[PDB]
Design an enzyme around this catalytic site. Structure first.
Site, PDB file in Angstrom:
ATOM      1  N   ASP A 177       0.879  -1.147   0.021  1.00 14.94           N
ATOM      2  CA  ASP A 177      -0.005  -0.069  -0.018  1.00 14.94           C
ATOM      3  C   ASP A 177       0.940   1.303   0.245  1.00 14.94           C
ATOM      4  OD1 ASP A 177      -2.144   2.008   0.656  1.00 14.94           O
ATOM      5  OD2 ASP A 177      -3.177  -0.092   0.879  1.00 14.94           O
ATOM      6  N   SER A 210      -6.774   4.530  -1.038  1.00 16.37           N
ATOM      7  CA  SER A 210      -6.805   3.019  -0.859  1.00 16.37           C
ATOM      8  C   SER A 210      -8.440   2.415  -1.133  1.00 16.37           C
ATOM      9  CB  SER A 210      -6.584   2.837   0.684  1.00 16.37           C
ATOM     10  OG  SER A 210      -5.214   2.999   0.942  1.00 16.37           O
ATOM     11  N   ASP A 269     -11.496  21.525   2.112  1.00 17.09           N
ATOM     12  CA  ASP A 269     -10.832  20.741   1.094  1.00 17.09           C
ATOM     13  C   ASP A 269     -10.208  21.645   0.046  1.00 17.09           C
ATOM     14  OD1 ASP A 269     -14.106  18.959   1.242  1.00 17.09           O
ATOM     15  OD2 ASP A 269     -12.384  18.550   2.198  1.00 17.09           O
ATOM     16  N   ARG A 307     -21.025  13.148  -1.405  1.00 18.67           N
ATOM     17  CA  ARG A 307     -20.352  12.263  -0.480  1.00 18.67           C
ATOM     18  C   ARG A 307     -21.536  11.954   0.846  1.00 18.67           C
ATOM     19  NH1 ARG A 307     -14.609  11.672   2.164  1.00 18.67           N
ATOM     20  NH2 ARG A 307     -15.300  11.825   4.536  1.00 18.67           N
ATOM     21  N   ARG A 335     -21.252  13.820   5.341  1.00 20.55           N
ATOM     22  CA  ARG A 335     -21.541  15.147   5.752  1.00 20.55           C
ATOM     23  C   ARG A 335     -22.719  15.760   5.336  1.00 20.55           C
ATOM     24  NH1 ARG A 335     -15.660  16.051   8.227  1.00 20.55           N
ATOM     25  NH2 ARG A 335     -17.283  17.477   9.110  1.00 20.55           N
ATOM     26  N   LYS A 391      -5.672  -2.118   6.712  1.00 20.05           N
ATOM     27  CA  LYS A 391      -6.210  -2.312   5.221  1.00 20.05           C
ATOM     28  C   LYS A 391      -6.994  -3.439   5.004  1.00 20.05           C
ATOM     29  CE  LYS A 391      -3.615   1.254   3.952  1.00 20.05           C
ATOM     30  NZ  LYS A 391      -4.138   2.574   3.473  1.00 20.05           N
ATOM     31  N   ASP A 438       2.173   2.851   3.233  1.00 18.35           N
ATOM     32  CA  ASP A 438       1.240   4.100   3.300  1.00 18.35           C
ATOM     33  C   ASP A 438       0.941   4.416   4.635  1.00 18.35           C
ATOM     34  OD1 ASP A 438      -2.419   4.632   2.905  1.00 18.35           O
ATOM     35  OD2 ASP A 438      -0.741   5.561   1.546  1.00 18.35           O
ATOM     36  N   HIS A 461       2.387   8.400   5.899  1.00 19.95           N
ATOM     37  CA  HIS A 461       1.487   9.518   6.246  1.00 19.95           C
ATOM     38  C   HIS A 461       1.938  10.274   7.474  1.00 19.95           C
ATOM     39  CE1 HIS A 461      -1.940   9.249   3.550  1.00 19.95           C
ATOM     40  NE2 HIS A 461      -2.289   7.924   3.769  1.00 19.95           N
ATOM     41  N   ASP A 493      -1.357   0.071  -4.775  1.00 21.27           N
ATOM     42  CA  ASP A 493      -2.616   0.780  -4.841  1.00 21.27           C
ATOM     43  C   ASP A 493      -2.681   1.986  -5.313  1.00 21.27           C
ATOM     44  OD1 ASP A 493      -4.183   1.376  -1.686  1.00 21.27           O
ATOM     45  OD2 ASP A 493      -2.037   1.124  -2.209  1.00 21.27           O
ATOM     46  N   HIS A 494      -1.326   2.832  -4.984  1.00 21.82           N
ATOM     47  CA  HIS A 494      -1.198   4.111  -5.494  1.00 21.82           C
ATOM     48  C   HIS A 494       0.129   4.435  -4.643  1.00 21.82           C
ATOM     49  CE1 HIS A 494      -1.944   5.100  -1.072  1.00 21.82           C
ATOM     50  NE2 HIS A 494      -3.079   4.220  -1.321  1.00 21.82           N
ATOM     51  N   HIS A 522      -0.493  10.828  -0.119  1.00 18.00           N
ATOM     52  CA  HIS A 522      -0.412  10.152  -1.213  1.00 18.00           C
ATOM     53  C   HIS A 522       0.219  10.874  -2.679  1.00 18.00           C
ATOM     54  CE1 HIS A 522      -4.161   7.499  -0.106  1.00 18.00           C
ATOM     55  NE2 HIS A 522      -3.106   7.433   0.661  1.00 18.00           N
TER      56      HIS A 522
HETATM   57  O1  LIG Z   1     -15.707  15.671   5.864  1.00 17.72           O
HETATM   58  C1  LIG Z   1     -15.103  14.827   5.272  1.00 17.72           C
HETATM   59  O2  LIG Z   1     -15.259  13.646   5.173  1.00 17.72           O
HETATM   60  C2  LIG Z   1     -13.819  15.552   4.734  1.00 17.72           C
HETATM   61  C3  LIG Z   1     -13.623  16.686   4.536  1.00 17.72           C
HETATM   62  O3  LIG Z   1     -13.773  17.286   3.367  1.00 17.72           O
HETATM   63  O4  LIG Z   1     -12.758  14.625   5.272  1.00 17.72           O
HETATM   64  P1  LIG Z   1     -12.322  15.061   6.866  1.00 17.72           P
HETATM   65  O5  LIG Z   1     -13.862  15.668   7.158  1.00 17.72           O
HETATM   66  O6  LIG Z   1     -12.326  13.787   7.525  1.00 17.72           O
HETATM   67  O7  LIG Z   1     -11.368  16.188   6.674  1.00 17.72           O
HETATM   68 MN   LIG Z   2      -3.619   2.371  -0.274  1.00 16.34          MN
HETATM   69 MN   LIG Z   3      -3.672   6.538   2.928  1.00 16.83          MN
END
Ligand SMILES: O=C(O)[C@@H](CO)OP(=O)(O)O
Ligand SMILES: [Mn+2]
Ligand SMILES: [Mn+2]
Length: 503
Positions: A10, A60, A152, A255, A258, A328, A395, A399, A436-437, A454
């Site tokens: 990874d 991942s 973000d 997503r 949130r 993982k 991985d 980090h 995987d990256h 990454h």
């Molecule tokens: O809200 C989320 O899922 C994104 C932020 O854009 O990741 P995190 O919140 O963990 O920073």
């Molecule tokens: Mn990975």
């Molecule tokens: Mn990672």
């Protein structure tokens, strides 16, 4: 049974520079010996090659989905982008029904979402496509409830997105900002309902401060020391007539995590976080399905993946093992199987516990030796056809953005790799060693600062089969077809990747 194994290192990629590159600085004699003896190539694990936008580093979840599927698995952002670009979007049934609802009740169309180009939760260009659609079907006006990012994307960037969206409203002749909330408020995911209620009250023209323009209220926040993420929800004066019976909402976030809470407030009749009077005859459209408790029409439905590697193995009466340490384990299970928890027939799994540390630089070997011993134990049973293994370490330690621990992590993996692969080779089997990256190929900026992310670099592939040459490039979606090639199992048509092995 001759075993074939996919061994995923990874966060381990190919990068020319040696600077802060733990992959190249590590003593990895086992990897190098296989690399020197066996056929090798490199494949892409980032961007469009894995169903992400250009320029976006792999990860991942996306990487293990692409690996198990044997095709490019398009993620939400790219799928919606492509739908727009090719016209499907403007025909979408849910979007056109939301508009029929508004037109038939003489009511109002509202649009919620994260107004940035972060690409994690949303993309503000999808708002512009919705406005174009609304104008095309004659909606007249559209109330936009902006949720500001700063997380973000750059922490003070809201004013650019607001300006550009204000120009769109003029250009297209439609829509206006109705309310403006930091994502702290509108996009909580820890059931802190008092934060959510403030967003709700602004959106609804109940209790909130009011400003004459979106800009004004944001600049007021800045002057107080509260940047985008933390903007206290506000109402835009004369531009908010509330959410009333008959209205429609489109939430462009893709997503779930949130977007769910706010959506429950409007559209879960059982909602009890705080007391509400829900809107009646509300048409509530979400870009994806955020959970099962929201009464929503789903603009882009989940696509189930048929004929992932594990399902093909099943249907050829083969046995398979998924194995990794905790960090993982979902990857080599759920994601590998195309987003499915259930075991296939013939599938068994081995979970090895990861150490309980805040950052994995404290134990760079993690549980890699115990993963290796569990695996040797399984291969000594002689009853496995297919193994999917992941060594988490490069991985997870990478980090940390710390070079020496990341090097130590790779060196621990290398020692385990040699015992796993030599065993596979004593059993007359085959390993594909890949990733995987990237991540660990770069743990320092060019100015020697920690780098904790990454990378977009391509990943190595070694296939431990003599007398064969690999194709010169390719992508993650080619790995499962290469395993099927090694197993001499027929590849079905919905697996659109191609074996890396040249014939
Ligand atoms: O809200 C989320 O899922 C994104 C932020 O854009 O990741 P995190 O919140 O963990 O920073
Ligand atoms: Mn990975
Ligand atoms: Mn990672």
């Amino acid at each position: 049974k001759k075993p074939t194994a996919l061994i995923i290192l990874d966060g381990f990629a190919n990068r020319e520079s040696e600077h802060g590159n733990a992959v190249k600085l590590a003593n990895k004699p086992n990897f190098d010996r296989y690399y020197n003896k066996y056929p090798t190539t490199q494949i892409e694990a980032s961007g469009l090659d894995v169903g992400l936008p250009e320029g976006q580093m792999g990860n991942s979840e996306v990487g293990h989905m692409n690996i198990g599927a044997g095709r490019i698995v398009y993620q939400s952002l790219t799928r919606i982008n492509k739908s727009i670009e090719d016209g499907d979007f403007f025909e979408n049934d849910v979007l056109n029904n939301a508009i029929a609802h508004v037109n038939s009740h003489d009511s109002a169309l509202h649009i919620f979402g994260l107004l940035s180009d972060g690409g994690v939760h949303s993309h503000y260009k999808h708002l512009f496509a919705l406005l174009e659609l609304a104008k095309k079907q004659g909606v007249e006006k559209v109330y936009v409830h902006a949720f500001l990012d700063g997380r973000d994307v750059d922490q003070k960037s809201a004013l650019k997105y607001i300006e550009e969206t204000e120009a769109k409203f003029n250009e297209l002749g439609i829509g206006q900002f109705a309310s403006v909330s930091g994502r702290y408020y509108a996009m909580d995911r820890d059931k802190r309902w008092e934060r959510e209620e403030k967003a709700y009250n602004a959106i609804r023209n109940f209790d909130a401060p009011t400003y004459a323009t979106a800009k004004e209220g944001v600049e007021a926040s800045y002057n107080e020391g509260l940047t985008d993420e933390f903007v206290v929800p506000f109402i835009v004066e004369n531009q908010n007539d509330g959410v009333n019976d008959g209205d429609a909402v489109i939430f462009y976030n893709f997503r779930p995590d949130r977007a769910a809470q706010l959506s429950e407030i409007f559209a879960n009749r059982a909602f009890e976080g705080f007391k509400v009077e829900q809107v009646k005859d509300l048409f509530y459209a979400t870009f994806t399905k955020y959970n099962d408790n929201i009464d929503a029409a789903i603009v882009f439905e989940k696509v189930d993946l048929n004929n992932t590697i594990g399902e093909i193995a099943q249907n050829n009466n083969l046995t398979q093992l998924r194995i990794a340490e905790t960090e993982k384990y979902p990857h080599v299970t759920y994601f590998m199987s195309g987003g499915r928890n259930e075991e296939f027939k013939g599938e068994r799994r081995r979970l090895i516990d990861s150490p309980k540390v805040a950052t994995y630089d404290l134990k760079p070997e993690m549980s890699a030796y115990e993963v290796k011993d569990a695996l040797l134990e399984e291969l000594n049973k002689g009853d496995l056809d297919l193994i999917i293994l992941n060594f988490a370490n490069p991985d997870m330690v990478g980090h940390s953005g710390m070079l020496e621990p990341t090097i130590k992590a790779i060196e621990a993996v290398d020692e385990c790799l040699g015992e796993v692969v030599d065993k596979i080779l004593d059993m007359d089997g085959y390993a594909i060693i890949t990733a995987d990256h990237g991540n660990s190929d770069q743990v320092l900026t060019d100015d020697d600062q920690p780098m904790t992310t990454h990378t977009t670099n391509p990943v190595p592939v070694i296939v431990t089969k003599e007398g064969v040459t690999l194709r010169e490039t390719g992508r993650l979606g080619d790995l499962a077809p290469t395993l099927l090639d090694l197993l001499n199992v027929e590849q079905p048509e919905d697996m659109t990747g191609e074996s890396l092995i040249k014939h």
